[model samples]
Target: EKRKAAAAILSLGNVLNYLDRYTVAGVLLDIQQHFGVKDRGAGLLQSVFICSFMVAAPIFGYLGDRFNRKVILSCGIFFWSAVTFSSSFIPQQYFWLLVLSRGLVGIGEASYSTIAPTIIGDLFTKNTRTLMLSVFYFAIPLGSGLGYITGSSVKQAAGDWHWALRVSPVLGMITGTLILILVPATSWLRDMKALIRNRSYVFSSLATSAVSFATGALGMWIPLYLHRAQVVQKAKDSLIFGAITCFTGFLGVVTGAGATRWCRLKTQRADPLVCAVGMLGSAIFICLIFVAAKSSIVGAYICIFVGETLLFSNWAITADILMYVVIPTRRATAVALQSFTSHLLGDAGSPYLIGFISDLIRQSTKDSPLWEFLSLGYALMLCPFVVVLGGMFFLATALFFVSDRARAEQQVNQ
Candidate 1:
């Protein structure tokens, strides 16, 4: 009973973690106005946050393996809550403080994400474990979607965007306290060199990184992108985008689990192939989003709904593959390093890069709102190609999964 209880609590923590993190995306335009920045400057906020997040993961990853899990996690939540709260009070004159606060918040969040999955791995096995992990990955879109919905509505009600930053920090304190009371702590990194040769692990992380890059850009830009598109494409705002993402998150995760399980009845290599097919298929719909935005908003929404559903299908599966290919003792460091490389090559550069590209394409032209929308959409078009590349990585994972997983089972038995 307590085993499921503990995981429930742990899973709740991940949901709470992102509720605060993605709140920024929900309220981005307001922050952009207060800071008086261009698209690139707007993009910098997320880049800095992810940069700090990736930098902190390796250190926290090492600590998770070395220290008592509950205490470390609680402390991280405490830090995140405090940093987020303090971020709200920052004067508009000090946009740098706002950026700095987000980076600090990133450090706190890195604490939970890199360590939490390892605990689920420690507790569950087989279908049960996979189910828990899927629930765990559900936090990303669910929490983020809610963040957008709440942030938008909260600001609309309060008449101050600053109020958006106020709610989640309170949830943080409660999450940390509950962890201390309810969670069990067992403490334990290296063999990074060995991971370098884990073909399944390496390729999986690379593929996950591609997801991060696309996800980050979408998080920061899509709400804003669609808002701009509304002037022409005739669409809803962040709140609407949030609802769509919210619906897709659960649908995608469930679909992923079902498809993989069904396929596994046929082939041992099913996970990667399923992941590849999802990404490749997702690329088509995501590509079609731009084409639809050019003509019909309804068509674009259909594309986003289908595209994101496929894009998210692999979220839980990636963690499942890592558990299969990595030994338990090494799981913490494994997850941490996976987070490291995923953000390092993935989300770390993406928001900034996309904004930079969008701005670069615009290049001193403000005459027509049409070009402004076109410029941003063109930059976003880059993500589907990257997605295609990620599918290629997953196909590579299919080639190497059996061999690496066999090696892991051997390593574990020894």
Candidate 2:
């Protein structure tokens, strides 16, 4: 019963984590226009936040290994909520202050993201862990979609971007308090060197990082893309996109989790294989999205649904691979290291890179009538290929999955 309660709150935090992270996506254009910056400049805000997150994850990971996790988590929540709450007061000219606030938000999130999953790892056994993680991760798309809905709705209604930013900090302060009062602490120490040698863990982390590259780029840009492409209007585009992501993203996570659970009945290698197959499918569907972008709006939305469903299917299984394959003492470190690598190599740079690419294309194609449309499409064209690369890495991880699990099981039994 205690474990269930903890999972419930931790999951709520996860939802808010993503909600706060992506809320800016809905207001990027507004922020851009209000601050008189181009796409690259606006996207840099997300990049700075990710860099702060990647840099802070290792410290939190180390602390989580040695300290009372609930306290660490609570402190992080308070810090971020306070920062976010204050960011709402930044004037339009003080764009740099907003950037600083985002970086602090990353630090706060690193505290929760690194520790929360390890708690789930300790609370459940192999058969139940992945399913529980699926429940936990179910918040990713839902929270992200809600982030869009909340940002867009609040902005559309209030006519203020700062007001849209207010929602998460308020909710985060409440959730942070809930975590401190309710969630239990779990911790153990282990050498980092041993974790680096876990071949399957390394591969899975790299694969996950690759997926993050695509998601970061796509999630940050999709609403803007739809609006620029003239397929949808401003606020309505965010609403429609959020609606699709919320509904389809949930279906995808559940379907993926269900599929993996069924496959686990047949073989231990099923976890990595599920990620491999799902990512490959995601690549294929994403490629179809490029073609669909020009053909029809309905086609583009269908592609988003199918591709995201496949992409998200990997969330629980990959986390399961890390927790089950790493020893209990190092699970928090494993989660932290994964965050560092995934974001450092993945989403941390993709949003900024995509924006940079879009800027170059826009400048170079100034003579073309379809320059705006062409530049954005081509900027995102790189995402599918990156996702395909991630799929291949997951396939490689499958080659090592059985042996890794065996070694982890031996450690547990000892």
Candidate 3:
């Protein structure tokens, strides 16, 4: 029963999550020109979305467990979509209104992130839970790509930014309606007393938040750097959507999930270590890509493509760590709290920080210093690698706690 509800909710919600966020990136050039804003100002607009979404992530995540999940999810989709649609009509002059509407989208996204994964953990057994979540997360690439394709096609065909903004709300409305019709309201929502008792859930949630902070800082901001700094435009974005998703992300999902089916082995307590290793590898590879200093356009694209392939492949392993520590009941909220902490500290405010720095550097120079904007964005991105290392350090501490418990449990089984 839990699986059925989780599958239904996560399947749809993930798509909406990508659509809501990806639309801005796809139409970034248009948004910049439409508002007559510099990259720094434009970045504030992007930050609005992340800040609103992330600040509210844990609140809704906590609420999802306390109330009817179906109601929470439905309200979320409705609110997010309605705002996404409303964005179409905001007069270009009043950019602040657009910021508020983006906040609404964030609120809605927070609700889903908080509740959906917890439900998923309840629905599936421990052994297969990580695989299921990874499959559900496919929307990160697919839905984002869908938004990109849709935005690109609409802007090209209609030559109107409003049309692109309008399409997403309609998508949200349709998906929300389907969820209302199909999903049964679950009565299982309640306070996470059981989870609070568990030390791993408490410690691990912080680490999870750090992962999100690092991921968020890197994920959305990098595109701007690739575009303005390297003149990469959305070429790297297209490749991520089209090629990277088809090959690496998909392969990671299949091979990763398949590993559990064969292992059917004892519970491993060192999953965070795996996430730590993946992050370390990601840091090294990202530095190499930057240092390679590919001058030509093609070389830049190739490096980013391979770089993301290695970078994103870490998702499954990280989720595996979270699922290992959390109980079925509080897992979703745990994930949500992770979202809140990570974004609030790491990615949530990164765009604004990057934008402010970019503007500062650009203003100091009389002529438009082109590389300054890109440099600021990439520099902000690099901060997360350091934070992720810190998270891994916590993971090492958390692992000791988890392993002691695991050993005690093993003795009981004996």
Candidate 4:
């Protein structure tokens, strides 16, 4: 019954989570024109969200452990929804206002991410936990894909960008209300202060942050690359991109979780092996996306899909490792810390950084500098693979700490 409730609530939360995140991008063309910003400058939209998300993640993670996760999660939903809807009403051409709203969205997202997974952990044991998280994480593609299609359709029919941004919050508002009424708060909420272990907490946090920095920023530029670099101009490009997001991204989470779970079935040392596989796979895919993307424009999109599917799974895998290593109470904080590091170093400056490069090329060239933009994006995208590789190596080396039987028992106990 607890697992049922956990999955049900998480599914709804996950949908809203990605919906809010992806909607901004779908409506980017309008926002760019409305704000008189270039593609490079526009990347700030995601930067703003990720920045606020990184800062607030740790706080919400702490709150989830110390207070009621349901309350925090619900408040986060309502708060972000309110901000997202309000973005439409804010007077146009005020760049700072948009920045502020974007930051608010990040804060709200942090609240959801920091608390949701730990609640999931408490709801289920280790054996099924990864699967549950994977299901929840899959919302990234599902919600983002829908956002792309709907945003495009609405822009055409309503002839208004404001409407595109404003409508989804209504659904978010509904989900929050349902959460308050139907979802029961977990008992893991009891005295979380006892769980803090500084060293492990900080290491895991920084590691995940490195991972986020590389991918988070790179992801922002992919659509622009596809549109300009590959010339995938049809409306369906959004769907195709979204499909890449779902399939590639989905595989990452599943593979990571599945590998870890599989290792536990065999012996204790499987955790490190699992991490190694995920890290290596992600690194390979990251490079593949760049090389393959350049081969054929359409093929590039397919490569992007394949890469993200395998690589992004690190989210679930990393989180699973953190939860496994840490005590129940500290898991939220640990995850939040990961959010903070990843966003701060990886995503926060990505928008302006990527934009600056694109702007630089736009100045030098007379026509649209599509190749320049694609090159810059691909170049920067490689950083995550390096970090992921390092993290995997570290995990593999750390295996001396635990035996296979102990690790298997962890799963068995769960």
Error of 1 at 8 (Å): 1.0
Give candidate 3's error at residue 293 in angstroms: 2.0
Residue ranges of candidate 2 with Cα displaced over 4 Å: 29-41, 90-93, 185-190, 221-235, 297-301, 355-366, 369-379
lDDT of 4: 0.68
Rank order (by lDDT, best first): 1, 2, 4, 3
Tens digits of per-residue lDDT for model 1, 1-414: 776777888888998898988888778887787677776665678878888988898888778766687777889999989998988988778788888988999899898898889888888888888888998888777788778778778977874658889998888899788887887655221378787878899999999999888777776688777767777765267557768878888889999999988988788998899999999999999887777766663444688889889988998889999989988767778898889888888777787799899989899687578888889988999899999999999999999999999999988897
lDDT of 2 by residue, 12-99 (tens): 9999999888888768888887778888776678778888998999889888887688888878888888898898888888788988
Clashes of each: 0, 0, 4, 7
RMSD of each: 3.2, 3.4, 5.2, 5.0
User: What is the clash count of model 3?
Assistant: 4
Residue 86 CA error for candidate 3 (Å)? 3.3
For candidate 2, report its TM-score.
0.88
TM-score for each model = 0.89, 0.88, 0.77, 0.80
Report the poorest 10 consecutive residues by lDDT, candidate 2. 227-236
For model 3 the local lDDT of residue 260 reads 41
Cand. 1 TM to true fold:
0.89
lDDT for model 1 comes to: 0.84
Off by over 4 Å in 3: 1-9, 35-41, 184-199, 213-267, 294-303, 351-391, 394-398, 401-414
Kindly report which residue pairs in candidate 4 clash with one another.
209-342, 213-346, 248-309, 249-309, 252-313, 253-313, 268-404
